[PDB]
Symmetry: C2
Amino acid sequence: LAFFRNMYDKYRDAFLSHLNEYSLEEEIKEHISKYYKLLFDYNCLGGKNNRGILVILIYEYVKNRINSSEWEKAACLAWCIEILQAAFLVADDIMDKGEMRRNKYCWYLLKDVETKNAVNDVLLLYNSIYKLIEIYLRNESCYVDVIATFRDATLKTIIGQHLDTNIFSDKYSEIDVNNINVPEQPVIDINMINFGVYKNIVIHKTAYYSFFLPIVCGMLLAGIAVDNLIYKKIEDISMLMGEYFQIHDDYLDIFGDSTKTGKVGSDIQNNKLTWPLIKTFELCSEPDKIKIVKNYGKNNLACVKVIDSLYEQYKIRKHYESYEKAQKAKILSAINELHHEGIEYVLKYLLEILF
Amino acid sequence: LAFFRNMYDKYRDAFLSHLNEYSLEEEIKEHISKYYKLLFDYNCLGGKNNRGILVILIYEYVKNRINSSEWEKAACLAWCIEILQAAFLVADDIMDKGEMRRNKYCWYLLKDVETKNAVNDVLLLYNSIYKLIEIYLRNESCYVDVIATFRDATLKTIIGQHLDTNIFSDKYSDAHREIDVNNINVPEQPVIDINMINFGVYKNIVIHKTAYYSFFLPIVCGMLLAGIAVDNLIYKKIEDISMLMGEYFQIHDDYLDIFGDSTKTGKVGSDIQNNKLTWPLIKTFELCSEPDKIKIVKNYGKNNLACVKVIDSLYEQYKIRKHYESYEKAQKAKILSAINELHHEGIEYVLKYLLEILFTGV
Ligand SMILES: CCCCCCCCCCCCn1cc[n+](CC(P(=O)(O)O)P(=O)(O)O)c1
Ligand SMILES: CCCCCCCCCCCCn1cc[n+](CC(P(=O)(O)O)P(=O)(O)O)c1
Ligand SMILES: [Mg+2]
Ligand SMILES: [Mg+2]
Ligand SMILES: [Mg+2]
Ligand SMILES: [Mg+2]
Ligand SMILES: [Mg+2]
Ligand SMILES: [Mg+2]
């Protein structure tokens, strides 16, 4: 748990040491090293490390204790999920026009970096994961399975990101391969404002890589066979938790304090399909629906304030607090159907310290 | 060869079919399908397919035969390289502010798409490769090596792309002033750095951004699938020939940027204005007068018609064409000469054939 945070250097340096065997001039290696060490440090560190820790804990509680070389393998997987979260966040911040991430400037904003490097850096971070899993796990029998779990969890995440970005776009309300001139002014589409669609989005963009992936990694490494019916249970629990997690993320966007979140709220002006939007829309008068349509999704101070004051008016805080409690019970109740004391504990623990 | 282009549908749909197993609402499935089918068609089609055909041919001419299900596995690897080329290109065109690719608008320029979709679409195209390799090769014994070969060739391409993109940047000149993590405000106005204008640095760059994925990768794919063991000393010879061919390929690409005709190349030149370390730039710089050096420093790397014209009219004054022609002939011989030290008639044949049709295709 604090052992985890100590190993970071080792995994970071094992990758950087791969790059350094490349066939390059020495001065050029020096530059590569400088740049990519900062890419890792700036983007991998400063998080809560929930996903990484969940790998460690699942591994430990499925087993009956664990030598130092086994911890090396588990910690690798833990740091691989964190590297994945780093990549996802660097990409998300490009897509959502981020300002601040973990209390500092978004990577893509930096004048030495820009969008062109940040795009290139994401794919690098992504691929570094698989090189690290090779270095430390190429000889484990769970090897192929672990790498399929990263690959599939990623694919789902990309699909959710696509939905999150396009769900309101004209695409969805044929793609014009001749239009490069006429930009789509963002509007909300009333038909897509429902929980069914929301759940589709958040389960894919969040649930698989934040929950399913770390848990499965621990399980795979501890040697639970891929065919055990437990995996399907863990998948369902993961969906519940991801939905729980993302709804809380949505709530923080409006109601959180950015000095504590480390990031600036932006869902309203970015025209996002969020929980607060859906809830308000389900609750509000017909004129207030018209007001939302006219005001949502505009980078414009008075507009955002109207949507804000609607969230207060319809008591979205209170409705969240009320969602949080029902969903927590529903999750706990699914957890108790696992029939595995070790995993059930870790998931209950996770639930407590998730925020 | 035309068998290869026929198989495309099968691999595209195999992946599309996988997406369509996802737990989503039926109408959302319909939208996903329609978007991602176009993603693949728009970007995977219309190329010369050199890298893909190189896999097919290597597969064939190591072997002495091959049934329809062995070919299905090879064709898959062939299309996977073409998917990889599609992804690299969508990403390149973002990085290089492209206008035109294969005679149409770059994917990222489309108003239905934009940068935020194209970036997401690249990782998608990337991962689709590994899903395809799993569908068709999960039981082959060469499986784990194949996916390592993609992974590693990709890593080298990315590093090449970083150098291609940063080699003249303050990052690399100042080099002793660290990356300022507090500057989002003051944008680096781009200038060339004279210390980097040499072939050694060039070769570093083009070997990584071009040679590994365009030559090493497809060849090693065919070889791994046909059954040559990963320890055979021929791989290291194939590596060295790949370096030579990639160098040779990129220098030609650089030549096309300035001297090509864009209705034939399918893309608009942009190296001078994007501040790229190119072969023409280095040749000129090695030949030209001292005042002409200064003129290059002032004018190179500005999106600015008069400035471009200056550089371009320098390339014409020092006759960079001729110099290219003279490079092309010497490098070709150097490559033929290496190919003949393979001691493998099939591969040697395929590489010599590749050399003939590299710029023309088919
Ligand atoms: C979403 C971010 C993750 C994905 C990022 C992938 C990064 C790797 C991109 C490598 C592109 C290498 N490559 C080599 C050759 N060119 C052709 C062009 P030129 O080298 O730019 O001249 P051309 O435009 O002339 O055809 C491109
Ligand atoms: C190959 C390079 C191309 C990029 C390919 C990878 C793109 C996939 C992006 C996955 C990110 C999903 N993800 C889930 C959670 N959030 C957090 C933010 P939210 O935007 O509110 O969901 P927040 O900024 O509020 O914390 C992001
Ligand atoms: Mg987002
Ligand atoms: Mg965001
Ligand atoms: Mg958010
Ligand atoms: Mg480029
Ligand atoms: Mg280019
Ligand atoms: Mg070029």
